[PDB]
Each structure stands twice: as C-alpha cells, then as structure tokens.
C-alpha cells in the first residue's frame, strides 16, 4: 500500500497547474512517526495563511485556552451630585471580538453608574499596543480590504466572524439615472463619503466599485449599479480602528441617555490618575472560543492582534517585534525546530514570511500532543462541511469524497502562493501533512491539494460517500 501511495502523490504532483512552481510536500504518520512522503520538505517557502498555525499554537502556549480579553471605561473619579464627569476613556486591551452590542451594553453601565453628562472629551485608549497599524511589507493596495485592516488594541468587530477595523458599506439602487444610495454602516459620521455612483438602466452591466483611496478615511464609490440589481454590500477598512470604536461608543452613550459635550479622540489615560474609576467593562470569550472564528475563516486581524498580545504577555509590549520573538520562543518550548522559519507577521499576509513543509508537520505533531490538542484541532476547517463555522474556508472543497468531514487543515492563498496543511484522522493511522506551493502562475492549485488530501483520507481508511 505504501508504495502505491507514494506513486499516486508523485503522479498528482505531475499536474501542469504546478509548472514552474516549487512545492514542499510532507506526510507523516502521527502515531508511528513514520515518514510516508516528503519532497523539498526543507525548502523555504511562503506559507500564506498557514502561518496562522504557528501563531495559533504560540497563542495557546503563551496565553492559553483559558485566556480572555478585556475592555474598560474610566473616569478620574466616579460621578456624583449632578452625575457629571470630565474626560471619559474607552480602554481596549486586545479584544478581537468587541461588538457594537458590547459597546452598547457598556454605554448602559456607564449610565447605570450614575453618569448623565461627560462634560469633557471622550477618548479612545488603544495604547496597550503600539500604533504600528500595518506590517512594514504589506501592499498598500490591499489596504481597503478587511484582510488588511489596521491593527489596534481598541477595535470593533463586525459580524459573527468578527472582522475588525472594518465597516459595512451598502449600495442600494435607485431609479435609472438617479445617484445610487450609499450607506457606510458603522463608519457613518466617522468616515467621509464620495458617492459618484449612479443607477444604471435595468439589465445594464454592473460596474460599481467601492474603495478607500490610500491614505484617506474616505469611502469612494464610483461606477454604475443597474436598477434591477440587488442591493450590494461590502466590507471596507477605515483609518484608526480606535477612533471608530470611540465614535460608536459616542453614539452608544448618547443612546443610553448620557450626553457628551466634548469631542471623540485618541489618547491614553493620564497615568497621573492614581485611582481612575472603572465605570464599565467587558470581558470576551476565552481564547479557545475565539480560536474557532479566527482559524475557520483565517482572520488576519486576529492573528496580528494575537502576536501583539503575546508581545504583551512575554515582554509587556504590544509589538510585532516582541510578539514575534515570543512566538518563535514559544514554538521552541513546544519542541519545534524553528531553524528554517522566518516570522514577519502573524497572519501570513506578509511576503516576508518563510517556512518549510517539514517545520509545519513538525508543529502538527507537537501541537497534536500538547494539552490543548483538542481546542486546537477543533478550530481547523473541516473538508466539505456546509456549516461555515465548521467547514470554514474548506466548506466548498472535497465534498462527496473520502476527505469530507475528515480532513482538518488550514488553507492559505495569495498570488503564486498556496498551502494546505493539517491532519487526516483514520483507522489506518493518524496522519499529519503539509503542502506548500510557490511559483505557479495561474490560479492556486487547490484541486492538486485536494487530490492529495483525498488520497490521504483513503490511505487512512475512508471511503467516498455514495
């Protein structure tokens, strides 16, 4: 059987979709520790989102499944007679799941706390992390999109997938000839809008485009949306995720009967205050829970926020430099050889990252036996599973095959980069694998990755459903 498996993979790797592409492929039997297959396992390649694997493991080691994040509201001293206060500070400490609901819940506490007026200014404190919003080598052209959202300690998360630093932009068609109707979602009143979009005739081509011009906090909409066209929605990042959290909290307070006479702005709690009053606070779910949405949908904001949290825990510094070193350290304490590893960021978006298929499998074996093995493997996306929170970025892959609901693996794709690394649980042996492709020029070789994952699932003792 073994010999057949090897030949089969060699054949699959013969796909023309992998021309001019270096591919690191490693397969190992977790149980026996046997090396079922290996090709360029020591070759340094860009891992794309697969990099999140290393960040996720590091997070469990340094923060732990138990870990959770907090958000506070503080005044110099509690309110009194007329229930007034001067400056109010919204302090974020890395919660990547802070919803607008959470903010409203807090706006309520501040009110129940006896506050009716914020005579001073309302400040958003995100100093828990540095202000380095984007990784040095991230392409500025990717900035308008969610996966490239600015990183901040205080940031609001959209939806149940917790997309940070973004706002939801909607474009609804009007009558042919009339301007299209644009809604900026949360960023309303915060970001500037330049709506040049127009309703085209019914049946006309949809040429609409939503964008945030680099270096601005403006949502520019151009193009034409046909009248008979279904309203469009999109996620666009904003500048200074904190200034937005402050804006929404500003609106949350007002909604909870608390007036704010000042202005919303960035700024940390004076430190001059020996006993600031904590009018309100929120605590997120534990890391083990937050891991799911992070890994299932591959959330870059979460990965980066995690690195800096690790930087805070290991060195008291929400910095990529600190966190990254902390990640590399943690991986070592886990028994992983970080020799051919190069960490430039936590999400894998950075072209500066480098790993080797061997290192990945290495991290898979170790992680597989660590105390948090369960919560860990449970965050990985499962092959061909409709439910988004289970299938993740693999919901629409390998369906109706031996891998369906069997292969647990992290995906990762960029131009010329693609990877699929994970586990293949089975009666014929517990398998760990890694596939990293760099160099291909057409689309990502996802069918090749699947083909291999499906053959492995079979080798592990699984049959396609009928």
> What is the b/e burial string over 144-162, where b = at least 16 CB atoms within 10 angstroms of the residue's CB?
bbbbbbbbbbbbbbbeebb
Give every CB contact of residue 394 below 8 A, 6+ residues apart in sequence.
381, 382, 383, 384, 385, 407, 409, 411
Q: Does 284 bind Co ion (CB under 5 A)?
A: yes
Q: For residue 14, what is the DSSP state?
A: T
Determine the Cα angle at 53 with ends 286 and 337, to 5°. 120
Q: Does 102 bind Co ion (CB under 5 A)?
A: yes
- Any idea which residue has 């940031």 for tokens? 155
Residue among 23, 224, 288, 298 flagged as catalytic: 298
Nearer to Co ion, 102 or 125 (CB): 102
Q: Which of 359, 463, 374, 366 is nearest to 421 (CA)?
A: 359
Nearer to Co ion, 284 or 413 (CB): 284
Q: Does 359 bind Co ion (CB under 5 A)?
A: no
Q: Does 63 bind Co ion (CB under 5 A)?
A: yes
Q: For residue 26, what is the DSSP state?
A: E
Binding-site residue positions:
410
> What is the b/e burial string over 292-316, where b = at least 16 CB atoms within 10 angstroms of the residue's CB?
bbbbbbbbbbbbbbbbbbbbbbbee
Q: Does 263 bind Co ion (CB under 5 A)?
A: no
Q: Does 166 bind Co ion (CB under 5 A)?
A: no
Strands 417-424, 413-414: pairing kind: antiparallel
Nearest distance in Å: CB 285, Co ion: 7
Nearer to Co ion, 265 or 270 (CB): 265
Q: Which of 5, 6, 39, 67 binds Co ion (CB under 5 A)?
A: 67
Determine the Cα angle at 382 with ends 380 and 383, to 5°. 140
Nearest distance in Å: CB 337, Co ion: 26
52 is catalytic: yes
Q: For residue 239, what is the DSSP state?
A: S
DSSP per-residue codes, 168-186: EEEEE--STTSBPEEE-GG
309 is catalytic: no
- Any idea which residue has 């829970």 for tokens? 289
350 is catalytic: no
Q: Provide the CB-side half-sphere exposure for 25 (13 A, CA).
A: 21
Nearest distance in Å: CB 140, Co ion: 25
| H or E element that contains 413 | strand 413-414
Q: How far apart are CA 438 and CA 22, in angstroms?
A: 5
Q: Does 239 bind Co ion (CB under 5 A)?
A: no
Q: How far apart are CA 164 and CA 194, in angstroms?
A: 23
Residue among 23, 49, 152, 350 flagged as catalytic: 49
Nearer to Co ion, 137 or 188 (CB): 188
Q: Does 72 bind Co ion (CB under 5 A)?
A: no
Nearest distance in Å: CB 104, Co ion: 12
Binding-site residue positions for substrate:
410
Nearest distance in Å: CB 289, Co ion: 10
Nearest distance in Å: CB 124, Co ion: 14
Nearer to Co ion, 368 or 405 (CB): 405
Question: Which listed range, 28-36, 60-68, 136-144, 337-345, lies at the site for Co ion (CB under 5 A)?
Answer: 60-68
Question: Which listed range, 183-191, 207-215, 304-312, 380-388, lies at the site for Co ion (CB under 5 A)?
Answer: 183-191
Q: Does 188 bind Co ion (CB under 5 A)?
A: yes
Q: For residue 298, what is the DSSP state?
A: T
Question: Which listed range, 4-12, 182-190, 193-201, 263-271, lies at the site for Co ion (CB under 5 A)?
Answer: 182-190
Nearest distance in Å: CB 388, Co ion: 12
Q: Which of 64, 70, 267, 416 binds Co ion (CB under 5 A)?
A: 64
Q: Does 189 bind Co ion (CB under 5 A)?
A: yes
Question: Which listed range, 19-27, 65-73, 263-271, 435-443, lies at the site for Co ion (CB under 5 A)?
Answer: 65-73
Q: How far apart are CA 78 and CA 397, in angstroms?
A: 55
Residue among 23, 52, 284, 309 flagged as catalytic: 52
**Binding stretches for Co ion (CB under 5 A):** 63-64, 67, 97, 102, 159, 188-189, 284, 406, 462
Q: Which residues are annotated as catalytic?
A: 49, 52, 298
């Amino acid at each position: 059987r073994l010999t057949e498996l090897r030949e089969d993979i060699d054949a699959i790797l013969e796909d023309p979709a992998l021309e001019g592409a270096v591919s690191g492929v490693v397969v190992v039997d977790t149980a026996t520790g046997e090396e079922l297959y290996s090709r360029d396992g020591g070759e340094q390649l860009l891992p794309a989102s697969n990099m999140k694997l290393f960040t996720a493991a590091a997070a469990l080691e340094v923060l732990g499944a138990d870990h959770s994040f907090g958000t506070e509201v503080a005044a110099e001293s509690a309110p009194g007679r007329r229930g007034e206060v001067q400056d109010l500070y919204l302090v974020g400490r890395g919660d990547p799941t802070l919803s607008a609901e959470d903010l409203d819940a807090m706006a309520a506490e501040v009110a129940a706390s006896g506050v009716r007026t914020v005579r001073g200014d309302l400040y958003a404190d995100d100093t828990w992390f540095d202000s380095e919003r984007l990784v040095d080598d991230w392409w500025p052209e990717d900035e308008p999109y969610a996966y490239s959202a600015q990183i901040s300690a205080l940031t609001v998360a959209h939806g149940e997938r917790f997309d940070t630093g973004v706002t939801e932009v909607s474009v609804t068609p009007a009558a042919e000839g009339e301007p299209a109707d644009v809604d900026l979602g949360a960023a309303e009143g915060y970001a500037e809008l330049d709506n040049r979009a127009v309703t085209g005739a019914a049946g006309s081509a949809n040429t609409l485009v939503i964008d945030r011009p680099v270096g601005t906090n403006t949502i520019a909409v151009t193009g034409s949306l046909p009248a008979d066209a279904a309203p469009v929605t999109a996620l666009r990042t904003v500048d200074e995720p904190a200034a937005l959290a402050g804006h929404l909290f500003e609106e949350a307070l007002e909604s909870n009967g608390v007036t704010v006479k000042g202005d919303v702005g960035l700024g940390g709690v004076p430190a001059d205050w020996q006993d600031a009053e904590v009018l309100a606070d929120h605590t997120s779910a534990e890391l083990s829970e937050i891991l799911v949405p992070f890994m299932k949908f591959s959330n870059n904001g979460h990965a980066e926020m995690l690195v800096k949290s690790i930087g805070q825990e290991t060195a008291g510094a929400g910095t990529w430099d600190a966190g990254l070193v902390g990640v590399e350290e943690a991986l070592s304490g886990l028994g992983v050889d970080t020799a051919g590893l190069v960490l430039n960021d936590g999400s894998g978006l950075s072209r500066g990252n480098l790993v080797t298929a061997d290192t990945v499998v290495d991290l898979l074996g170790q992680a597989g036996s660590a105390p948090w093995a369960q919560t860990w493997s449970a965050s990985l996306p499962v092959a061909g599973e409709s439910d988004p929170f289970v299938g993740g970025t693999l919901a629409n892959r390998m369906r109706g095959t031996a891998a369906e609901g069997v292969v647990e693996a992290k995906t990762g794709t960029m131009s010329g980069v693609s990877a699929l690394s994970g586990y293949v649980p089975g009666p014929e042996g517990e398998l760990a694998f890694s596939i990293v492709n760099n160099g291909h020029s057409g689309p990502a070789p996802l069918a090749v990755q699947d083909a291999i994952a499906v053959r492995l699932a079979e080798y592990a003792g699984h049959q396609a459903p009928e």
